[PDB]
RNA sequence: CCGAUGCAAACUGCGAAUACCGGAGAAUGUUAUCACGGGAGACACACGGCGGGUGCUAACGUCCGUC
RNA sequence: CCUCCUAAAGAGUAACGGAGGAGCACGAAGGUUGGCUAAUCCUGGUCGGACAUCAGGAGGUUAGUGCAAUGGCAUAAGCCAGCUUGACUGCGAGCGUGACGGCGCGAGCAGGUGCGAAAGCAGGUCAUAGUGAUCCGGUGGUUCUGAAUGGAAGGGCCAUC
RNA sequence: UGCCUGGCGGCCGUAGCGCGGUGGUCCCACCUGACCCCAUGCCGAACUCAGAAGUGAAACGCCGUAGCGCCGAUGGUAGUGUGGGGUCUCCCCAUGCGAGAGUAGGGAACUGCCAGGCA
């Protein structure tokens, strides 16, 4: 018988993000951290070093990993 | 050990002669005998279960572990996590001695000894049976009997068909049905 | 299921060590033989591998698999790593238990003077 | 309820155009871009096209996103 | 204050729009090591037949993970045994948003801890709601200052009911 | 440099599911007892101690089986940005981008390094 929250990917592939930048703040884990990418308590992927952002599918389950390569 | 030598000497030889395999251990082997109770009457009293568990520990060489309930249904008035039964697992010398002691003295003395029930199989080779009057076993005496309880003994069979289980049961001549 | 469970359990540390990208020392223990490999961060090349099956170190060993054989493999790996310049690789137990031959091999490797 | 056939705003084993972010590039555009400072104005908008909600899927009825 | 749509595959975008729940809880349901990890269904059991329990199998995350609801979750973010309190103090590059008050994530440094052989982990709880700003009143520290001097009354900031 | 076996990565159904056959030279697996290092929320259940005493039972390596499953064209089809038109609730015209599914076709995977037996 509220206020929308901000979701989705903030930094896409090819962006030369800085260390600590939040690539994606999602509900749970839509994508998994790979190389030089962390995972916060709230399941937030944040960059660890300067470089370009890439998304790659790997693993038997075909899960997408967010990774950072040298700039 | 004590009975495995005679097993390999005679039972394996007879079964090999009967079935004409190639591998020496092609005859399926028993791993463990699981001692269990289908009493299902300890719901009201926990002391009954405690005494039965003490009896199981006394008869066997090791004490049992209390097992909790799996599901809760309102129709049968059962909650989740309710401790009702327990099991004992044996594998090795303890099992060999238990089987020898059973098949030597305990099996013959059964009231209404019309034979075993070969039809009571799992359909894949395992044979599980349950009989009352645990008093028959010698480890339990008449002066220390609380109530009549049923048993549940399931022999382990690695075969893929019931013919191998039938042969293994007949190994001890399977007195009759 | 034994091999699958072992591999699944080892995969935890196997992936954990990959984030920091350091050379890893893994040990595969079998009653017949024991093997110890040093794997680069890439994961496709091994800097140095030692095995009990080869006769280079099995001549003085009565049997290929035992505590003495594990110690010999550990010391051989340690000396080879010293002369190669591994620079303090990390260690992995491959999902085994660090109480028996694995512990003996680790102690033998650390005896040479390693800092892992 | 067993299998099959059609169907959907709090249905997708697949999946467009369009929109959004970033990188590289010829051409054009009076820098049209960004930052700071002075000064503002305005704070009941109307109508029409495009795709929907609402409405009795009757209304030159009603509200939305774009132009 | 949170759980999906109308909302036209970035975010956002309507009418007491369609929908409920939290306004808690765990001081253990926190951290660390080892190992384990189904649900469901066929079949045997004194009744058990699936439905009060156990073991031989099909099946691999449909069970669960404290909640109304939601995503992702078997290297389970579960579930047995172990040891403790990192739910510690000063902090903190960068990032996500906001009109502000601010909120959240966060690499990493200094002190000293628990789990470990080490690698390393721990700045509370799998997460999204679960709370209180301003003013006022209660307590501890500070001579920081004190209307001549030394005190004191009264103020200023630190913890905080 | 060829066959076979294990370990470490990429690839994640062209790696999978079902069926028949082959592997003890080496390697791998089944296991005895554990009073000894270690332990069971009971069980030597799992890990640890001594191998060929026997074997390839089961798992696993390989060949065929295209039966199931997977990928996968060209083309067409639906859709759609832009400008216009009509009988304007809906459709069409010129242009650009282009579905899913299925068909042809493939495949019973491939590749990098180390170790060991036979050549």
CSV table of C-alpha atoms (C1' of nucleotides) in Angstrom, one decimal, chain E residues 6-154:
chain,number,residue,atom,x,y,z
E,6,U,C1',7.8,1.7,-16.3
E,7,A,C1',12.9,4.8,-17.9
E,8,A,C1',13.6,4.6,-25.4
E,9,A,C1',20.9,-1.7,-24.0
E,10,G,C1',26.2,5.0,-20.3
E,11,A,C1',24.3,7.8,-15.5
E,12,G,C1',19.8,10.5,-15.0
E,13,U,C1',14.8,11.2,-16.5
E,14,A,C1',6.3,11.3,-14.2
E,15,A,C1',1.9,11.8,-11.6
E,16,C,C1',0.0,9.3,-2.1
E,17,G,C1',3.8,5.3,-9.9
E,18,G,C1',3.8,0.2,-9.4
E,19,A,C1',6.4,-3.0,-4.5
E,20,G,C1',7.8,-4.2,1.0
E,21,G,C1',11.4,-4.0,4.7
E,22,A,C1',15.4,-1.7,8.1
E,23,G,C1',15.0,1.4,11.4
E,24,C,C1',18.2,-4.3,13.7
E,25,A,C1',21.6,-7.9,15.0
E,26,C,C1',26.5,-10.5,15.9
E,27,G,C1',31.2,-7.7,21.0
E,28,A,C1',30.7,-13.0,17.9
E,29,A,C1',27.9,-14.1,12.9
E,30,G,C1',35.4,-10.4,13.8
E,31,G,C1',41.0,-11.9,11.8
E,32,U,C1',44.3,-15.7,10.6
E,33,U,C1',46.1,-22.1,9.3
E,34,G,C1',44.6,-27.1,7.8
E,35,G,C1',41.0,-29.8,5.8
E,36,C,C1',36.3,-30.3,4.0
E,37,U,C1',32.2,-28.3,0.8
E,38,A,C1',26.0,-29.8,-1.8
E,39,A,C1',21.0,-29.1,-3.0
E,40,U,C1',17.9,-32.4,-5.5
E,41,C,C1',16.5,-37.5,-7.2
E,42,C,C1',16.5,-43.7,-7.7
E,43,U,C1',17.5,-47.5,-4.5
E,44,G,C1',18.1,-50.5,0.9
E,45,G,C1',16.8,-50.3,5.6
E,46,U,C1',12.3,-52.3,12.7
E,47,C,C1',8.5,-47.6,10.7
E,48,G,C1',11.3,-45.2,6.8
E,49,G,C1',7.9,-45.4,2.0
E,50,A,C1',11.5,-39.7,-0.2
E,51,C,C1',9.0,-37.3,3.9
E,52,A,C1',11.9,-38.8,12.5
E,53,U,C1',18.0,-41.3,11.0
E,54,C,C1',22.0,-43.8,8.2
E,55,A,C1',24.8,-45.7,2.9
E,56,G,C1',25.4,-47.4,-2.7
E,57,G,C1',24.7,-44.3,-6.5
E,58,A,C1',22.4,-40.0,-10.8
E,59,G,C1',23.7,-34.5,-10.5
E,60,G,C1',27.6,-30.2,-9.7
E,61,U,C1',26.1,-25.2,-7.2
E,62,U,C1',18.8,-25.5,-7.9
E,63,A,C1',21.2,-25.8,-1.2
E,64,G,C1',23.5,-21.5,1.5
E,65,U,C1',25.4,-16.3,2.7
E,66,G,C1',21.3,-13.7,9.8
E,67,C,C1',17.4,-10.4,7.9
E,68,A,C1',11.6,-8.5,3.8
E,69,A,C1',13.9,-8.2,-1.2
E,70,U,C1',18.6,-8.0,-4.7
E,71,G,C1',23.7,-9.6,-7.2
E,72,G,C1',27.7,-12.2,-7.4
E,73,C,C1',29.3,-16.1,-4.7
E,74,A,C1',32.9,-24.4,-4.9
E,75,U,C1',40.2,-20.9,-5.3
E,76,A,C1',32.1,-20.5,-2.0
E,77,A,C1',32.0,-14.3,-0.2
E,78,G,C1',30.4,-21.6,3.1
E,79,C,C1',31.7,-25.3,7.1
E,80,C,C1',34.4,-28.7,11.1
E,81,A,C1',38.7,-28.5,14.0
E,82,G,C1',42.3,-24.2,16.1
E,83,C,C1',44.7,-19.4,18.5
E,84,U,C1',43.5,-14.8,19.3
E,85,U,C1',41.0,-9.7,19.3
E,86,G,C1',43.7,-5.6,13.3
E,87,A,C1',36.6,-3.9,15.7
E,88,C,C1',44.5,-1.2,17.7
E,89,U,C1',46.9,4.3,17.5
E,90,G,C1',48.8,8.6,14.1
E,91,C,C1',47.8,8.6,9.4
E,92,G,C1',47.2,8.4,4.4
E,93,A,C1',48.6,9.3,-2.5
E,94,G,C1',44.5,8.5,-5.5
E,95,C,C1',39.3,7.7,-6.9
E,96,G,C1',33.6,7.7,-6.9
E,97,U,C1',29.9,11.3,-6.0
E,98,G,C1',27.4,15.6,-4.2
E,99,A,C1',24.6,22.7,-3.8
E,100,C,C1',26.7,22.4,1.1
E,101,G,C1',27.3,20.0,5.7
E,102,G,C1',30.0,15.6,3.9
E,103,C,C1',29.8,10.1,2.7
E,104,G,C1',32.2,5.6,0.7
E,105,C,C1',36.5,2.8,-1.4
E,106,G,C1',41.5,3.0,-1.1
E,107,A,C1',47.6,1.6,-2.6
E,108,G,C1',51.0,2.8,1.2
E,109,C,C1',54.3,4.8,5.7
E,110,A,C1',55.6,4.8,11.7
E,111,G,C1',54.5,2.0,16.7
E,112,G,C1',53.1,-2.5,18.6
E,113,U,C1',50.1,-7.1,18.0
E,114,G,C1',47.3,-12.3,16.5
E,115,C,C1',47.5,-16.3,12.8
E,116,G,C1',51.7,-18.9,10.2
E,117,A,C1',57.8,-22.7,8.3
E,118,A,C1',57.2,-19.0,4.9
E,119,A,C1',54.6,-16.7,1.1
E,120,G,C1',51.2,-13.2,3.3
E,121,C,C1',46.5,-11.8,5.8
E,122,A,C1',43.8,-8.7,9.7
E,123,G,C1',42.2,-0.5,10.2
E,124,G,C1',35.1,-5.5,12.1
E,125,U,C1',30.8,-8.6,10.5
E,126,C,C1',29.6,-11.1,1.9
E,127,A,C1',27.6,-6.5,0.7
E,128,U,C1',22.9,-2.7,-0.5
E,129,A,C1',18.9,0.2,4.9
E,130,G,C1',19.9,-0.3,10.0
E,131,U,C1',20.7,6.2,12.3
E,132,G,C1',21.7,12.1,14.6
E,133,A,C1',23.7,17.2,12.4
E,134,U,C1',23.1,22.3,15.2
E,135,C,C1',22.1,23.9,20.0
E,136,C,C1',21.7,22.6,25.0
E,137,G,C1',23.0,20.0,29.5
E,138,G,C1',27.3,15.8,32.5
E,139,U,C1',32.5,14.3,33.3
E,140,G,C1',38.6,14.1,32.5
E,141,G,C1',43.3,16.9,30.6
E,142,U,C1',45.5,21.5,29.3
E,143,U,C1',47.7,27.8,32.9
E,144,C,C1',46.5,27.8,26.2
E,145,U,C1',44.6,32.5,28.0
E,146,G,C1',43.4,34.9,32.5
E,147,A,C1',40.9,42.8,33.2
E,148,A,C1',48.1,44.9,38.5
E,149,U,C1',50.9,40.6,40.9
E,150,G,C1',50.1,34.5,42.6
E,151,G,C1',45.6,32.0,42.5
E,152,A,C1',40.5,31.6,41.4
E,153,A,C1',35.6,32.6,38.5
E,154,G,C1',35.0,32.5,33.4
